[PDB]
Hints:
The structure is cut from a larger assembly and holds chains A, B, C, D and E. Chain B is an alpha+beta fold. Chain B is 42% helix and 26% strand. Helices cover 54% and strands 5% of the residues of chain D. The longest helix of chain D has 15 residues, at 293-307. Chain D is globular. Chain D starts with a helix and ends in a 15-residue tail after the last strand. Chain E has helices at residues 14-26, 68-81, 103-115, 144-148, 168-172, 190-197, 213-242, 250-278, and strands at 9-13, 33-42, 45-53, 86-93, 123-124, 136-137, 183-187. The longest helix of chain E is centred in the last third of the chain and has 30 residues, at 213-242. Chains in contact: A-D, A-E, B-C, B-D, B-E, C-D, D-E. Chains A and D meet through loops of A and loops of D. Zinc ion binds next to loops of chain E. It is classed as motor protein, hydrolase/protein binding. Keywords: 26S Proteasome, motor protein, HYDROLASE-PROTEIN BINDING complex.
Amino acid sequence: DIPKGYMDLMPFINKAGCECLNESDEHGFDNCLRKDTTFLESDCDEQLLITVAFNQPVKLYSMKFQGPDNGQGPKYVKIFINLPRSMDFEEAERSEPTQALELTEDDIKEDGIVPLRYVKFQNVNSVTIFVQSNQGEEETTRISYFTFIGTPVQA
Amino acid sequence: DLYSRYKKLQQELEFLEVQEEYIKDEQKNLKKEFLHAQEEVKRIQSIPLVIGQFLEAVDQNTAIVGSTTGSNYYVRILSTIDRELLKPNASVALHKHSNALV
Amino acid sequence: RQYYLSKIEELQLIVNDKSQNLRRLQAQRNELNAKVRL
Amino acid sequence: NQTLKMIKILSGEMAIELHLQFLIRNNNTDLMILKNTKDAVRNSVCHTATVIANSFMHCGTTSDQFLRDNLEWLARATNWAKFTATASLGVIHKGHEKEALQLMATYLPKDTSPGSAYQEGGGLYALGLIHANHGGDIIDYLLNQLKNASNDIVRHGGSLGLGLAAMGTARQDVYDLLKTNLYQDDAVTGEAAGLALGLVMLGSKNAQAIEDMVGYAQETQHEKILRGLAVGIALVMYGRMEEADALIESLCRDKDPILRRSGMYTVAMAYCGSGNNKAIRRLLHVAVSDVNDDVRRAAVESLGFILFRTPEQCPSVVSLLSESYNPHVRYGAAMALGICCAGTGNKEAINLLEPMTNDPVNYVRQGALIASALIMIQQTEITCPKVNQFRQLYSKVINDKHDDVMAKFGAILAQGILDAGGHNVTISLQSRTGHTHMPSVVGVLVFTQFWFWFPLSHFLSLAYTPTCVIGLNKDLKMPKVQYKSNCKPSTFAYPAPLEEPNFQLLDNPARVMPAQLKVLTMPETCRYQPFKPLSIGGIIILKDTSEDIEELVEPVAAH
Amino acid sequence: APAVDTAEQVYISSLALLKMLKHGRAGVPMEVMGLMLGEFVDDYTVRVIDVFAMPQSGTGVSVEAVDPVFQAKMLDMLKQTGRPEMVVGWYHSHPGFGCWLSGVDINTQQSFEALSERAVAVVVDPIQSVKGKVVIDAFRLINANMMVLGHEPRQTTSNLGHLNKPSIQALIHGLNRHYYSITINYRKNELEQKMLLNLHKKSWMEGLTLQDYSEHCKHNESVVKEMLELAKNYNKAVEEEDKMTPEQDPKRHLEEHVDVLMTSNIVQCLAAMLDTVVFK
Ligand SMILES: [Zn+2]
C-alpha cells in the first residue's frame, strides 16, 4: 500500500520511548504494533494513551489506526507531538491536541488509512495518541494495527 | 465637452488630494528616518577614538591622516566636522576600527 | 449650461492651487529625502 | 454548421492559430543581438538571462534556431537553469498546440549526473505555457502527469504548467490535485502549488480556496511556499474590487511580511485598472510606512496595476518614490512605471527611468532596465526618441566586464523584451476594446516575481499580445490584401539589423503597432471592405464587394 | 548534481543572536565558540532556534574544543527541558578580525559538514558590534572538486543571494574561494519584540514628572543666551546676503535652538498643568 514517495516508519521506531497506558497485561502493546490479528486492549476503561518515539526526527503524513469490527475501534483521537514529559489523562483531555481526529467507521477497516495534517508534523520526535472514545461505546477498546506513514528528515 | 472636462477636473483634484496625503505621510516617516540617521552619525562619534594628525585634505569628504599608532591612512571626513577647523597637523580623533576622521 | 462653466472654473482654480501646494510638498520631501540619503 | 464555426472561434482555436501564423510569417528577430550576448556571457546568471531573452525574442514564432545552433553552449546550463531553459522552449512555441505533445516527445528524457528531473519539470512547464489560458485538451494530460509525478522538481514544473493551462477555469479536480501537492509541504513544489492554486481559481473570489490558502500560509514554515501562496492569494481575488476589501485588511494587518506583500498584490489584482483612490492611498501608506523592505517594494509595484488605465498619471505619483532613499522602494518605483506604462512608450516615464539606470544599487539598475524594455517595446526612434540610446545602454551593460551580475541580468532580459516576438508583440494590460486583459495582468504580475524565482520570468510571455491586423473573408481564410498606412515608413519600421513616401503598403497579416493602427486605412481599389473600422485592429472580417475569385494567403509551415 | 541555492538563508532567532553576542563579548580578547541548535527546514532554510556556549579551552577554537561529554549532556538535558533541536552548526568569535574563516576554522567546518552536508559556521565580531550595526556572517564551504572543475559553487535562481555585497576583509581570507557567505535573517516575532521593548520603555511616571524647575530655568537661560549670540550672527550673515549675488549656518543652529526651546517649554508647561488638574 502506502502513497508513492513515503515509507512505513516501523524501523525508525525507538522502543525506549514507546509506552502505553491502560493496557491489559494479556494484550501487549506490541500486538497493536505488529501486523497480526493480535490486538491491544485497554484494561480500565475506553480511554487510552500511547506514546511512540523515534530514533531520528520524522515527518508524518498518514496513520493506520485500525481495530476490530465489534465497535471497540477508536473514534476520537487527540494527537500530540514532541512531548517533553509523559502524558497524563487529565491533561490530555484538557490539553489542545496537535490534531483532533474523528475516526469514522471506514478508517477502522483493514484498508483504512487516515491522512494527517502534514504541515504540523514536520519535526515529529515522539507522537502521543489519546484515544478518548470508541465506536461501540464499550467498556474497553481494541486496536488491531497501529503505525505511521511518513519520511525521515535525514538528520 | 463640458461635462467631460468637469469630470476630468474632479478626477484630477481627487488624485491631487491622494498625492498630498501620501506626501504628508512620507514627510512624517522621512523625518523619523532622518532622526534615526542623525542618531547613528552622532553615535559614530562615541569613545574610544584614536588620535591622529590631519596631514592633508584630498577631497571635500576624504583626507590623509597620520594616526598616532604611527601609520598614515587615507580616510573619510565626517560631514558635520567644521571644514575651516581642518588645518594641517591639527589633532583629530578618528574612529577606532575604521580610522574615519570623526 | 453656464452652471457647467462655473463648476469647471471653480474646480480649475482649486486644482491649480492644490497643484502648487503639491509641488511645494514634493520639493520639501525631496530635500528631506536628499538629506536622509546623504 | 455555421454554429460550429463560431464555436471554433469562441474556443480560441481559430484566433490562436491565426496569431501563430502571423508571428511565424513576420518573424524579424535579429539573431546578431543574441550572438553578441552569448559572446558576452561569463556566469550562469547571464546564461539563464540569455536563455530567457532568446525565449522572449522568439515568443510564439516557434523558431528555436538559436538553441539548435548553440546546443553545445546550452548544455552548460545545469540544475534549475536547465529547467528554465527547457521552460523557455514553451514560450518559443506559444500557441503551437497541435504538435505540442509530439514535439515535446523529441526532447525525450535521459539519465545523467543531474537528475534530468529539471528537464521533465521544464517540459511540463513549457507544455503549460504553450497551452496557457487555452488548455482545454492538455489539462487531462497535465493532470495525469502531475498525479504520476514522483520527483519534487517534476512536481513543481507540473504544478506550474497545470496552473498555466487551467488559468481561470476554476475546475475542482485540478484545484484538488494542486491542493494535495501543496499539502505535501515541500519548499520547491510549494511555490508552484501556491501559484497554481491562484491561477486555477483566478478571479473566483472563492471562500474555500482563499481560506485554505491563507490558513496554509499561516501554518507552514517554508518561505518559498509563502511567496507562492502570496501570489496565489492575490490571483484568487483578481478583479473583484471592493469585494476584496475584507481580505485586504486581513492581509494588511498580518504580522508575516510575506502575507502583507500578498495583501499588496491583492490590492493590485483586485483594483487592477480601476484607479480606485482608496487602493492607491493604502498602497502609498504601506510603501512609505512598512518596516519590511519587500512589502514596500511590492506596494510600489502594485501602483502600476492600479493605474495602468491612466498611464499619464503614473509618473506623477511614482516619481518621488523613484528618488527614495530606500533601494527597494526605488526598484518598486521602476517596475511600477514599467507595468503602468508598458507598451505605451511614455516620455515622462522613460525620463524618470533614465537616471535610474545608473543607480549605485545593482538591482535598482536591473529593475530600471527591465521597466525601460517594457515601456519601449516595439517603439521606434521617431515614436520614442531615446530608444536607440537605451539599446546601446543594454549592450554596454552586457559588454562591461566589471558591471554587476544583476545589472547584466536586467540588461539581457531588457534586450529580450524590447525585440519580443520578432518585434511583433506588445504588452497591453488593456484589451483592444478596453477590457483588462486578464492573461496579460497575470503574466506581468508573476513576471515581477522573477525577483524570487527566475523560471517564473516566462510568465511574462502571457502579456505578449500580437500587434496584427488579420483580414478574414467570409470563409475565415486570409485573402492577399494590402492596407495603406498613411505615415512615413520609418515611423513604425523594424529596427535595422546589426552588423521616402508618406504611406506604406502592408500585406496580410500586417504588423501594425498600436499607434500605427490610427493612421492605417485600406485602399478603395481593394475588392474587400473592413467590417469593423480598421483603426481598432485585431482580427477583422472583410466583406467582399466582388464575385471575383479570391486568392488566399498561403499558410507557412512551422519552425 | 544538486547545488546549494544562493537564496538559502540562515534564520537566527532573537535569543540565539543575543546569546551569541553576550558570549562573544564575555570572552574578549579570547575567541569563544559554541554550538547552534535548530533545524534544516528545507533546502533553502537553516533555522537557528538556540545556541549554547561551550567551555573555554586552551586549544582555542578547534574541533578539539568541542568536549563530547559537555555537548552530549547539554543536548540531553535541553531535550529534557523541551529543546530537542539538532546541532545545526557552530559559531565562534573573531574579536576585531572581521568575519571570515581561517584555515583551522575551515578545518572545523569541514568536520561539522561531515556530520551533515547542510551546516553553517556563523562567526561574530564582538568588539566590532558597536550599538547599531552587528558584524556577523555565516559561511558554509566550497567543495574543492566543485571549484576546480570550473562550476560555480552555488546555483542562482533569484536576487535574494546578492542583495548584500561581500567584504574585502572576508574576500582576502578565502571568501568565494573556499567558503561562501550565507544571507542571515533574524526571526523576531511580535512577542519577542514587545518584550525587548521594555528595555527603554520609560515608565508611566516620567510622562508626568516635571523637570527640576530651577534646572529648567537655567537651561532656558543658557539656550536663550546661545540663541541671542546666534541671532547676532544671523543678522550679520543676512546683511552680507544683500551684497552677494547667488554665489555652519547661523540660521540652522538658530532653528535647532528654537525647536529645542519650544519642545522643552511646551512639554514642561503641559505636563505641569496636567499635573495641577489630575492631582486634585
Ligand atoms: Zn577562527
